[PDB]
Ligand binder design. Structure first.
Ligand SMILES: Cc1ncc(C[n+]2csc(CCOP(=O)(O)OP(=O)(O)O)c2C)c(N)n1
Ligand SMILES: Cc1ncc(C[n+]2csc(CCOP(=O)(O)OP(=O)(O)O)c2C)c(N)n1
Ligand SMILES: O=C[C@H](O)[C@H](O)COP(=O)(O)O
Ligand SMILES: O=C[C@H](O)[C@H](O)COP(=O)(O)O
Ligand SMILES: [Ca+2]
Ligand SMILES: [Ca+2]
Lengths: 650, 650
């Protein structure tokens, strides 16, 4: 009972830090932290190997709070176990510049593994964390040298399990046999609209059995013994595990078992009452020294990390090439990259050119993982050399995501968050729409996921409007911290991949054609590193045709038609708005000199082009089911129309 | 043995019309139509009640080809049953201007119910088709008077069942008990990447049994007797049913059971071999007259619809007032609406004002269905007077979608496609990312779904950057056939609802604040009907501040601040770019006079604003976890910054 009272005292410390931080914020989510405090205690005190002195210890267990809104459950337990998150920060919950924002932000807060809040993201991203551990183990572990051994734990809510992304990621996690992925579902029967049976009465655990997961239940979150056994059962199981954990939202309070406990402060009366009923004499933010001493993990984590650093030293003597590769990949250091593009002798789609860049890049990047959402032949994403990942071939660097763009987004982000890997995945640009939240989350975390988007335009032909992008380019360019690179040709494509791989600040979208487009010169194309450049200049420019991707070739043809009539325009290739806007003002004015009229050409939405052009040849309607180039021409992409657009400015 | 031969011969007409249409186009998807010919035969010939002569018959059975790549399956059987789809349109498969586009397009081919091609969308929209049939049947059917009674049939591929959206919608269909939804799954063990066990080994029917669906297998699609059984088992059952129908892709060709049969024409060799292995003598696009007269459905069609018209006259006699409302609703005629907004006395959030407009609007609109993806308390989407739809209360006008924004999108599209309902659903603007493909699909189809989006900016405060939109406005505005209306205040908000309810051509997104903003003059706010308008003019203006939603109030504060320094600017309110652009040039140039410098203010990305302003006060970064107004102010939305930006032009 001194063990039980210290457990109870410690669990309540978690409960009241959350209650009071929400109370003093007058904003946040107290209900779920109150019910799940016992699971937070058990993971951070007993189950997880982690180190509060070094959150980036590569061999730590990873905890993902997919149920983001319960941020204070995570802040309380980080604080209590000795992570560098002072009490003053928990008193600054949801305040400007605090390390305790409303939802967990990876990079903002020590020990936060994934930016959560958008439901389905945490639990889906966690599939990549665990795929990354499995594969890295397969690559590096040897007899008597186990340098990769950690689990991926997740706390998810009713919301997480309703989002279709979580089901897609569960299908793949089970298909892949990720034995070391352990998800806790807070089964507390309450959602924002009230009781879950308003909207959610499926047999959740039967669904997860069908995906090939183990399911377990724990009838009371407060029964630590029942949590301990379930966890041991999950680790013995070769399958990913879903542990349904029954809890009371607002546990211990007069808002217990109510949706009123979910998303607003308890109120002074209800905080007081919770204190009565849980036997908590301590005032706001005060926790006794007993609990600090019991919860301190600074020493157990020094011991754990030190034990791992020492196994690395034995690894480094027994296998020094393997050791230098792991250390290089864990630090995210790229090896030297080719300076010379592949050799192209004829017209080729930028998809096929992208395939050729990957044939050159993959054999020198064992970290580079690739895949597609069931478009491998159409996307050119399986490099020469790569084999399929499966349970039977855990060394395969090529991922068959199936028709699951969103969870592919989430799993790429997780593969890229883990350490050891750089991951890219493919689909048609139109189907970026199915993964938007995973794209935004990568830009928010600053995770450099590479999203490959082929079939960039109406030029794709007969598949027609449901497949032909229009708004997509401008919709992705408006997103903060996403480079959007639309190479004009096979050569630009090679430089686009160098830009993507070297860019670590956030994601890159590479935008590629289905149809064949001519070659530029490799020396001219290199200009892509500046995001925009003068491709074909002239004596005393009367104007500029500015263009992206396939439309640069339209522009060059319009340059000729105009030159024949004594009008002289230069052609600028703007493969990336973002990399161009990062250039010195002096370089941007050399390229697009003020006072010169400019026409933009791009087979997408006009909205945005006025930033650079006076007139745009663009597409502000949906496409059509017809062959290329007919579809392209009849929808107004001819060199005659670009020419006429330029003549209307002079 | 000679009905067995008319079946085989009809089934093969479907097969060969598809094969030859793909082979002549030299583009498209022959495999699935080959495998699934038998089911298309059975549905159009025997099972479905439909009228080739009136595809708009309100009480027809609805068929949704979710696996829209198999378009030649639908085009073949529509032709053979005497829909207005000539042999010449089959010969123009995927050619410019044809009635046979690569993927099925609602409103472009007689008898096509839903624009499909983006996998997940068909099977998901079908839940809205069924919910509409079920609700309208409950609202209008009377003892002796069955005026609503049809089934919603769906054909879905592997791809449809891997997409998270199809899971969300199956969860909701099972929860609602949509007895008359029947889904056939082409369980053909092939996908584009190769065998389905590359990425898809879940027990699909166990998952659907966990959603509370009935599941059935047909071991062979050619066994029409098996198919007849399954479909009768489905209709007897009160659950939605999924019928796994095993088929060989490329049935009868040397490309049978190969991914090579999926998405390319067979070629001559395999076309020629396939006529042999199935013994099909008739040359390309020749069907024997024996098959046209067997399959001709006009007679049976006319009789089914005459029966229903008779039941309607009987209904008009027995229930005059109900009949009048039903006819008005099926035709999508609006009844008269209030022309003056609710009365407002205090600063209020446009989410709350939206709530107050719906309290006013809904009692006059029995066709109006409301809902939220588990944010009913935060979206103000439950009108006073609405009750929860459930299996037990089918007359409820309010839909709890749970955390299923994507499936909500699809289901609102289904509701609004079916006839008799106008359906809207709410979530936070940031979560439009989860439902994008269904927003896009509304815009492609011209289906006037109304998407309610609250928490439109960093102004929402503490919930932080994962909840705060940035890119979303311009990302939506870029999409063709989408009105994006960001009303400035309580009064603008009422006129936005009028615009959205009166817009029939396509979807509308209403964008609302969490935080309260002041009231404008009721009579001024009427300007919203023109997209943009002068809110506060001045004498001989030296410039314009143009703004949308909340930032209108920021622009008036900056107007006043500029007057204090002897600088006069006019404030324009641009609640909708698309309604402004639709105004005559002369009105546009009245509102924004050429030559006058223009500073724009919007708490979202800059990209696009160059279309109207010379400077923009915008947000081109993610948000922060902090309270309003502080978070709004420190991220640069103050009257001092807007004024500063104007004076940097003057
Ligand atoms: C994708 C997404 N859609 C909507 C929301 C808005 N939202 C915040 S919390 C929540 C539901 C939370 O309910 P549950 O997951 O059961 O939480 P608990 O009862 O465990 O506190 C919703 C709809 C969100 N965070 N993410
Ligand atoms: C959302 C979405 N992602 C990707 C595609 C591209 N695509 C077309 S069909 C298909 C999958 C083909 O497999 P399945 O759906 O089982 O079709 P079948 O082999 O039966 O023809 C893919 C990836 C799509 N149409 N929609
Ligand atoms: O839609 C699915 C098809 O497999 C895909 O569209 C094939 O197209 P491709 O010839 O453009 O690779
Ligand atoms: O948990 C969910 C959100 O924090 C909540 O819905 C926001 O509530 P509000 O309506 O006060 O913005
Ligand atoms: Ca819950
Ligand atoms: Ca298939």
């Amino acid at each position: 009972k001194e063990t039980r009272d210290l457990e109870t005292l410690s669990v309540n410390a978690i409960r009241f830090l959350a209650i009071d931080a929400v109370e003093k914020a007058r904003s946040g989510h107290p209900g779920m932290p109150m019910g799940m405090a016992p699971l937070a205690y058990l993971l951070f005190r007993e189950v997880m190997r982690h180190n509060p002195l070094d959150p980036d210890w590569p061999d730590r267990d990873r905890f993902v709070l997919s149920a983001g809104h319960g941020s204070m459950l995570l802040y309380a337990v980080l604080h209590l176990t000795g992570y560098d998150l002072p009490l003053e920060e928990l008193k600054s919950f949801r305040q400007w510049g605090s390390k305790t924002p409303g939802h967990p932000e990876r990079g903002h807060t020590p020990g936060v593994e994934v930016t959560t809040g958008p439901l389905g993201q945490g639990i889906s991203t966690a599939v990549g964390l665990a795929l990354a551990e499995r594969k890295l183990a397969a690559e590096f572990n040897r007899p008597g040298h186990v340098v990769v051994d950690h689990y991926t734990y997740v706390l998810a809510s009713d919301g997480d399990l309703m989002e279709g992304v979580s089901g897609e990621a569960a299908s793949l996690a089970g298909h892949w046999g990720l034995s070391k992925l352990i998800v806790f579902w807070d089964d507390n029967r309450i959602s924002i609209d009230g009781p879950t049976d308003l909207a959610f009465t499926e047999d959740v655990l039967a669904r997860y059995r069908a995906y090939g997961w183990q399911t377990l239940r724990v009838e009371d979150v407060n029964d630590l013994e029942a949590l301990r056994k379930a966890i041991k059962l999950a680790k013995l199981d070769e399958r990913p595990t879903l542990i349904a954990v029954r809890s009371h939202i607002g546990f211990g309070s007069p808002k217990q078992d109510s949706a009123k406990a979910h998303g607003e402060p308890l109120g002074p009366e209800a905080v007081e009452a919770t204190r009565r009923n849980l036997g908590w004499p301590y005032p706001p933010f005060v926790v006794p020294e007993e609990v600090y001493r019991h919860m301190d993990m600074r020493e157990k984590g020094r011991a754990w990390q030190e034990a791992w650093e020492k196994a690395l030293e034995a690894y480094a003597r027994a296998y020094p090439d393997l050791h230098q590769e792991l250390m290089r990949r864990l630090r995210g250091e790229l090896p030297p990259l080719p300076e010379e593009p592949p050799s192209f002798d004829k017209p080729i789609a930028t998809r096929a050119a992208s395939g050729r860049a990957l044939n050159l890049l993959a054999p020198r990047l064992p970290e580079l993982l690739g895949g597609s959402a069931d478009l491998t032949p159409s996307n050119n994403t399986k490099a020469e050399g790569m084999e399929d990942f499966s349970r039977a071939n855990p060394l395969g660097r090529y991922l068959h995501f199936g028709v699951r763009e969103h969870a592919m987004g989430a799993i790429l982000n997780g593969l890229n968050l883990h350490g050891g890997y750089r991951a890219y995945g493919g689909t048609f640009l139109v189907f970026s729409d199915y993964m938007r939240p995973a794209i935004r989350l990568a830009a928010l975390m600053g995770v450099p996921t590479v999203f490959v988007f082929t079939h960039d335009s109406i030029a794709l032909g007969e598949d027609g409007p449901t497949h032909q992008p229009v708004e997509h380019l401008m919709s992705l360019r408006a997103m903060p911290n996403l480079f959007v690179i639309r190479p004009a040709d096979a050569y630009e494509t090679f430089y686009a991949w160098l830009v993507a791989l070297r860019r670590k600040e956030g994601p890159t979208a590479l935008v590629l054609t289905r149809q064949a487009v001519p070659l530029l010169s490799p020396e001219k194309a290199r200009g892509l590193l500046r995001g925009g450049y003068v491709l074909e200049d002239v004596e005393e420019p009367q104007g500029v045709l500015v263009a992206t991707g396939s439309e640069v070739h339209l522009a060059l043809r319009a340059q000729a038609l105009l030159r024949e009539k004594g009008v002289r325009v230069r052609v600028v290739s703007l493969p990336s708005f973002e990399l161009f806007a990062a250039q010195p003002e002096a370089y941007r004015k050399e390229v697009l000199p003020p006072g010169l009229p400019v026409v933009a050409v791009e087979a997408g939405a006009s909205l945005g082009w006025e930033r650079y052009a006076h007139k745009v040849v663009a597409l502000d309607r949906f496409g059509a089911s017809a062959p290329y180039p007919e579809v392209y021409e009849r929808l107004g992409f001819t060199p005659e129309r670009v020419a006429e657009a330029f003549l209307s400015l002079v």
